[PDB]
Ligand binder design. Structure first.
Ligand SMILES: O=C(O)CCn1c(-c2ccccc2)cc2ccccc21
Length: 136
């Protein structure tokens, strides 16, 4: 019912910058045509919290996705690039840490507040992409 730290993430966010995302997606194993169309997208990401359930929606010309979850409880997720993964999202020190597991592989997406931005850092082995969103 009352305020939680998680509320710093809540709201409507628009992508403003993307660095190294094509190389990150190659590491993930996204095919060419999907990478090109995904990398063009300027999604809006809508984060909300209801009781213990956090919802992250991405809306764009590429794909609309929506996940709902409870921190530390694994779920099934079909990602925007069409992987079928098992995901767990935790809050570590203020950072939401989202680990996706599929086919023996793993990718971690961290989201954090920096100034008025929500920074999303996507990591697959040694390759990192930084995506910066701002309030809509
Ligand atoms: O949250 C994001 O900004 C990127 C989400 N995302 C996307 C994505 C694509 C288009 C629109 C939003 C997100 C592709 C993708 C591939 C691998 C891992 C994460 C991925």
């Amino acid at each position: 019912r009352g305020s939680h730290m998680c509320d710093a993430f809540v709201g409507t966010w628009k992508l403003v910058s993307s660095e190294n995302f094509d190389d990150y997606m190659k590491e993930v194993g996204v095919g060419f045509a999907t990478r090109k169309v995904a990398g063009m997208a300027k999604p809006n990401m809508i984060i909300s919290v209801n009781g213990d359930v956090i919802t992250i929606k991405s809306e764009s010309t590429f794909k609309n996705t929506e996940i709902s979850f409870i921190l530390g409880q694994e779920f099934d997720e079909v990602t925007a690039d069409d992987r079928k993964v098992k995901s767990t999202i935790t809050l570590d020190g203020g950072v939401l840490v989202h680990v996706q597991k599929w086919d023996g592989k793993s990718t971690t997406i961290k989201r954090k507040r920096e100034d008025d931005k929500l920074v999303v850092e996507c990591v697959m082995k040694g390759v990192t992409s930084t995506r910066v969103y701002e309030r809509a």
